[PDB]
Write a protein that binds this ligand. Structure first.
Ligand SMILES: CCCCCCCCCCCCCC(=O)OC[C@H](COP(=O)(O)OCC[N+](C)(C)C)OC(=O)CCCCCCCCCCCCC
Ligand SMILES: CCCCCCCCCCCCCC(=O)OC[C@H](COP(=O)(O)OCC[N+](C)(C)C)OC(=O)CCCCCCCCCCCCC
Ligand SMILES: CCCCCCCCCCCCCC(=O)OC[C@H](COP(=O)(O)OCC[N+](C)(C)C)OC(=O)CCCCCCCCCCCCC
Ligand SMILES: CCCCCCCCCCCCCC(=O)OC[C@H](COP(=O)(O)OCC[N+](C)(C)C)OC(=O)CCCCCCCCCCCCC
Ligand SMILES: CCCCCCCCCCCCCC(=O)OC[C@H](COP(=O)(O)OCC[N+](C)(C)C)OC(=O)CCCCCCCCCCCCC
Ligand SMILES: CCCCCCCCCCCCCC(=O)OC[C@H](COP(=O)(O)OCC[N+](C)(C)C)OC(=O)CCCCCCCCCCCCC
Ligand SMILES: CCCCCCCCCCCCCC(=O)OC[C@H](COP(=O)(O)OCC[N+](C)(C)C)OC(=O)CCCCCCCCCCCCC
Ligand SMILES: CCCCCCCCCCCCCC(=O)OC[C@H](COP(=O)(O)OCC[N+](C)(C)C)OC(=O)CCCCCCCCCCCCC
Ligand SMILES: CCCCCCCCCCCCCC(=O)OC[C@H](COP(=O)(O)OCC[N+](C)(C)C)OC(=O)CCCCCCCCCCCCC
Ligand SMILES: CCCCCCCCCCCCCC(=O)OC[C@H](COP(=O)(O)OCC[N+](C)(C)C)OC(=O)CCCCCCCCCCCCC
Ligand SMILES: C[C@H](CCC(=O)NCCC[N+](C)(C)CCCS(=O)(=O)[O-])[C@H]1CC[C@H]2[C@@H]3[C@H](O)C[C@@H]4C[C@H](O)CC[C@]4(C)[C@H]3C[C@H](O)[C@]12C
Ligand SMILES: C[C@H](CCC(=O)NCCC[N+](C)(C)CCCS(=O)(=O)[O-])[C@H]1CC[C@H]2[C@@H]3[C@H](O)C[C@@H]4C[C@H](O)CC[C@]4(C)[C@H]3C[C@H](O)[C@]12C
Ligand SMILES: C[C@H](CCC(=O)NCCC[N+](C)(C)CCCS(=O)(=O)[O-])[C@H]1CC[C@H]2[C@@H]3[C@H](O)C[C@@H]4C[C@H](O)CC[C@]4(C)[C@H]3C[C@H](O)[C@]12C
Ligand SMILES: C[C@H](CCC(=O)NCCC[N+](C)(C)CCCS(=O)(=O)[O-])[C@H]1CC[C@H]2[C@@H]3[C@H](O)C[C@@H]4C[C@H](O)CC[C@]4(C)[C@H]3C[C@H](O)[C@]12C
Lengths: 238, 238, 238, 238
């Protein structure tokens, strides 16, 4: 425990975390700079060693943080993310992984409380949304099957395959070129194609909007219930 | 009644409904798989018999459910949907019906309470919206007539027919290519076309947004009224 | 007054207004039908006389309604609209007016209370919005001037004229083809064009959204204030 | 102080500010008119002197306003804006500055209280949004780096440079031609490009919407807290 607490006070120190954030911001600049072939032709040699240094320093940090937090480390999503992001960056350059190394810049999120809270807040709405996401995903699935069968023979790029139809249906949901780009061309062969995509557009837009309405209104319903118990307590007491 | 209750306990059992959901999920996978010509060339023979089996099993189920629920069955929208969806799947392969058979996968909605409640909730906002939908539909109708008369001679694909103008006006409402794709081309012949579509875009966007504003605010007004009676009861009593 | 009240009871009768609505719906169908050249080649002779009849009947109605309501008629927006819409339909076929005759179908709005209330509600948010509309219109005006000066020489169709720039800026505000269709082409000559349109897009989207936020939140603030006085009255009294 | 108060009563007078607003509106019309080459060929000589006069009058005004307000002037954002906008207009015609002179029309905002309040209100939501903007900007930055590395070699116009990728990613965020215009072309070379842009679209849309949800709900939570203390005070007192 003597050796344990020595490490704990370092890993727990504000200098330690401020150092890591320093590295993250420095390496973030570096990774932008490595985007210029000009910059790489000259200073590229330096930035590569720096990225190797940062990676090793983050590996030492992850190791220390694990000795200090023990099993608690692997039950913490933030440090799980720090773990896998640093682990990715450790795969030898031997290819999409070289690109996924950029994800280590998200450590600026996992290391800054203001950023964690923002992400925690945004993520908190999702659990209640799961069943609606499942409903909408079943909806997409059923319509991707139908679209593949209706249109995939004449329009294989857009509908020749379940995956392609899934892609196009998502495009239609964002409303991107849905008419000039997909449905008008379809209607030159299938004049009733609009009977398929208009109702599809209605459901998916209607569901999106009503999802937002329900979150705002149900949130404020709770706010009211919480205020209601507070006022009713006082009137009963005083 | 002896024979009645025997069936009722089966049709009402959790195994019965869990079985049907099992079938729905299995058949849902099957229908995705039947999308691959590769898969069909090999295993296609099996999946066709399976779809025939599921269809017969669902027909037995609908029949049983009707003997158990009697007239209540046909006054229940969920089982009405199960009815017609299974009824569609019964039309002999002799063509758009073959595609509409996929709709039977929506039985996963009508059989899962979490999904029913979601759909019930989303549908509940619609009754209050009917008169606004009618207003907006009258609006579309009047503008489709005018557009057909103004533009249908020179731009028949987009406006040559009430139905075509209805289609294009919906496209303009989603804002999809409304300018580069429709109104700029129109303005090369009708320089004042923008006097028609800009105001059209204003009304339809303004109405959409204010529909959402009114639902949120009127919902919370009720929440307040309900909270108001509760607090006022206490102050009067205690 | 003897002759006055005789007319008043007719013009005020439910049959009278139900008749007019009947005519409006009949003529609305007629105007859709007159959209088919096929239909016009055959039954066109009949529908033209019918439109002449409806127009005369509405003119008699407007006349009666004016004798009954006196100056109150011309201070009523609904009957002002009925007036001008019927007045338009009276201009001899000698051309855009022939099209504006379709607007008489909006009388189905001004004659049906459910529709009036809907329109009244939607319109009620506008007065409070006037100064923001003016702000945003000044904003459009300043940017249309700048855009004309920056881009109108090389891109006259999109920016050669204040009016054209106004049009394109509205297009950019709806986000329709703003990049692939306008700003990327502009940037082939003016690489810094994005410094103009991105901030423009930020302001206009930010203002729209915050307009909606402010209506919902200020509405509910009032709802709270109104609930607050009610509860505070009770606690003081009981 | 004798000379000071003489100026103060003029600079503070309602005539003074009404005069300046008059000039702003007159010059605003002028600047629209100077947009027509026709108008400039004829009356152009007059409007140029008028713009020189207005500019000098505004410079006298800024000078007076500074003698009256002293250091308070340069701590006031509204008069800081009036300052720099008039200062821009003072740079000799020797080029983008000639265009930025139009910004002086925004003085109609800084001189009209109704407009100031509107702008103040809209701006007030921003401070609380800063950390989310930073989060989203870090997000854009990380994805612009990855996109440059994944796609910049084959698609240099859209992704060849951090700045270009930043631009395209903003375009994808507005949903403008994201599929037909960017991702489908990308997928002809990188079939898994959708694994990059779909999740990107999900995050950025999800964050936008939840930003709006959080402002409305947190605003009303405060409204409730404020109402809660008021009602609880009464029940305790009466
Ligand atoms: C907390 C939120 C983070 C804020 C992010 C700020 C975003 C910075 C955007 C600036 C990018 C400039 C792009 C640009 O100029 O064009 C590409 C150039 C030209 O390359 P070239 O030399 O012509 O070959 O290529 C370059 O010049 C490369 C420029 C790299 C600059 C790196 C500065 C980023 C600082 C953010 C560090 C955050 C760490 C996580
Ligand atoms: C309630 C809030 C809104 C809810 C939205 C949820 C609706 C679902 C949206 C999903 C949209 C994404 C679908 C998509 O882009 O691709 C689906 C994938 C792709 O299959 P794939 O054939 O490999 O890609 C086609 C493109 N190509 C030809 C160039 C390779 O193949 C698949 O089948 C993947 C299935 C997607 C799972 C969705 C979770
Ligand atoms: C609960 C979820 C409900 C889901 C609602 C959406 C249902 C989808 C409706 C399908 C609409 C059909 C769109 C369409 O045009 O598909 C193509 C088919 C076949 O094309 P077709 O017109 O026969 O000519 C093609 C000939 N060819 C290939 C040699 C050129 O075109 C046709 O076969 C024309 C017939 C269109 C029938 C549309 C009526 C379907 C109503 C939906 C059934 C109720 C479901 C609850
Ligand atoms: C409760 C929400 C439901 C969740 C739905 C999940 C959506 C699944 C999306 C996966 C689709 C994969 C698409 C894909 O890989 O490209 C098309 C392939 C290639 O065909 P190919 O063999 O190249 O000819 O064609 C295929 O490989 C066919 C793949 C069929 C896979 C079926 C898996 C779906 C399970 C969902 C079952 C729900 C029952 C209602
Ligand atoms: C307040 C919330 C928003 C409210 C939105 C409601 C506004 C109405 C939107 C309706 C938009 C759908 C209209 C549409 O797509 O087609 C209208 C149909 C089609 O006629 P049709 O000429 O067969 O189709 C044209 C396409 N073509 C040439 C390839 C055959 O022909 C028709 O006339 C059908 C009339 C549509 C009834 C709408 C209910
Ligand atoms: C209160 C809300 C009002 C609801 C409005 C409902 C909208 C009705 C949409 C139906 C339009 C059908 C369009 C269509 O089939 O294509 C155009 C056809 C073909 O012309 P064609 O004979 O091929 O030459 O041309 C035609 O067939 C002309 C069809 C005219 C049908 C008129 C039915 C509208 C009833 C609404 C009356 C409301 C009065 C204000
Ligand atoms: C806060 C909620 C959102 C507020 C939105 C308000 C922002 C203002 C949006 C106005 C957008 C409409 C502008 C427009 O479309 O045209 C402006 C007109 C047209 O001038 P013009 O040159 O005749 O038309 C150009 C098209 N062309 C070449 C084929 C003739 O020429 C004009 O200058 C008319 C000025 C429009 C007055 C706006 C009121
Ligand atoms: C309170 C409201 C604030 C409003 C904010 C918006 C202000 C608008 C900024 C203008 C951005 C300039 C966009 C642009 O590229 O316009 C074109 C000019 C001139 O083109 P240029 O690059 O000189 O080459 C053209 C040569 N040619 C014609 C023979 C091919 O391009 C250039 O001259 C390049 C220089 C761009 C300067 C951008 C910096 C302006 C910052 C805004 C000033 C602060 C205002 C408060
Ligand atoms: C408080 C909110 C401000 C409201 C802003 C109102 C917006 C006014 C839009 C009217 C613009 C008309 C555009 C147009 O007709 O096409 C361009 C013409 C044709 O030039 P051309 O003579 O054919 O060469 O070129 C022209 O005719 C130039 C027209 C300049 C008219 C100036 C009227 C603007 C008054 C707003 C003054 C506000 C001061 C800040
Ligand atoms: C939570 C609410 C939503 C939050 C949204 C914030 C997300 C950030 C959006 C920023 C989008 C604007 C980016 C952009 O348009 O250009 C980025 C600049 C341009 O670099 P540049 O290479 O000069 O321009 C490319 C266009 N070209 C080739 C014709 C010159 O180069 C840069 O790198 C500038 C970096 C932008 C800083 C953003 C602050
Ligand atoms: C009602 C709809 C689903 C429609 C069906 O049902 C679901 C989808 C997202 C859910 C909300 C979020 O989860 C955030 C928050 C979680 C709290 O825990 C309970 C309150 C609140 C507002 C949830 C309420 C409700 O559950 C929502 C609106
Ligand atoms: C006011 C507008 C129509 C504009 C006109 O009027 C209509 C359109 C949709 C209607 C709401 C939904 O129906 C959901 C819900 C039903 C309850 O029953 C009463 C409360 C609430 C919120 C309704 C209130 C109101 O009726 C709405 C907003
Ligand atoms: C605050 C913003 C303008 C921003 C600046 O200020 C303006 C624009 C539209 C205005 C609302 C509508 O008018 C509807 C309604 C009228 C009532 O009369 C007072 C309440 C309410 C909600 C108004 C509040 C406020 O006035 C709004 C939101
Ligand atoms: C909660 C989110 C950020 C998500 C994370 O956290 C941030 C982003 C914008 C912030 C609001 C605005 O600032 C306006 C206003 C300022 C008051 O001061 C406090 C109340 C309110 C409504 C703020 C609440 C909260 O702070 C918001 C919603």
């Amino acid at each position: 425990s003597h050796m344990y607490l020595r490490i704990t006070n370092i890993v727990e120190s504000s200098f330690f975390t401020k150092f890591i954030i320093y590295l993250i911001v420095l390496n973030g600049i570096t990774m932008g700079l490595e985007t210029s072939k000009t910059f790489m032709q000259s200073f590229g040699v330096y930035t590569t060693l720096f990225n190797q240094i940062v990676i090793t320093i983050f590996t030492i940090e992850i190791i220390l943080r694990i000795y200090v937090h023990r099993i608690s480390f692997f039950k913490d999503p933030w440090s799980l993310f720090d773990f896998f992001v640093v682990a990715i960056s450790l795969v030898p350059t031997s290819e999409i992984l070289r690109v996924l190394r950029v994800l280590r810049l998200f450590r600026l999120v996992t290391a800054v409380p203001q950023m964690r809270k923002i992400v925690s807040a945004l993520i908190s709405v999702i659990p209640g949304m799961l069943s609606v996401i499942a409903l909408m995903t079943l909806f997409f699935y059923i319509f991707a099957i139908m679209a593949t069968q209706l249109f995939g023979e004449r329009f294989p790029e857009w509908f020749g395959t379940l995956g392609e139809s899934f892609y196009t249906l998502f495009q239609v949901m964002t409303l991107e070129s849905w008419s000039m780009g997909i449905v008008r061309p379809l209607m030159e062969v299938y004049p009733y194609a609009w009977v398929f995509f208009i109702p599809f557009i209605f459901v998916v837009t209607f569901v999106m909007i009503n999802l937002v309405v329900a979150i705002i209104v149900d949130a404020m319903a709770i706010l009211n219930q919480k205020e209601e118990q507070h006022i009713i307590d006082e009137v009963q007491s005083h």
